[PDB]
């Protein structure tokens, strides 16, 4: 009945970051459905020789690396979200905040997204770069 103005890249971005981190609290074994194929993904961590882990691609290899990080009661605090229009119909969403897994303590992180169109007015995750500070500093 009422028609309202479409959301702005800044509004689209904060509303994705809102939807994302609450799902990861409620049910992280669905979090892969924000991604399409060709979707970059690293979520922190180190490897064998101490260096920062590398990325995984595609909706299915994400669902694997997402569940080995066994999320449990992820309590999360976004301090800052910044988002702007990009190449094509996309949005880049720098994110900064505090994530807490397994009742372990709060750790600061630095995140970038790229949200991309697919209906054509729906947004999926084409890249997702996440890094904790204490593993890089």
């Amino acid at each position: 009945s009422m028609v309202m103005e479409k959301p702005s890249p800044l509004l689209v971005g904060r509303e994705f970051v809102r939807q994302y981190y609450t799902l990861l609290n409620q049910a992280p074994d669905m979090l892969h459905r924000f991604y399409g194929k060709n979707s970059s993904y690293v979520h922190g961590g180190l490897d064998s020789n101490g260096k920062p882990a590398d990325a995984v691609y595609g909706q299915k290899e994400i669902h694997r690396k997402v569940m080995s990080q066994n999320f449990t009661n992820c309590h999360t605090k976004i301090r800052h979200v910044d988002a702007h229009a990009t190449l094509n119909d996309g949005v880049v969403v720098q994110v900064m905040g505090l994530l807490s897994n397994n009742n372990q303590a709060l750790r600061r992180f630095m995140q970038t997204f790229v949200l991309a169109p697919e209906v054509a007015n729906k947004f999926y995750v084409h890249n997702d770069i996440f890094r904790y500070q204490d593993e890089v500093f």
């Binding site: 994705f16 459905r33 924000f34 949200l115 729906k122 947004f123 999926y124 995750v125």
Partner: peptide, 8 residues
């Protein structure tokens, strides 16, 4: 409001 595979 909705992203990815999800259905409003």
């Amino acid at each position: 409001i909705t992203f990815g595979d999800f259905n409003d």
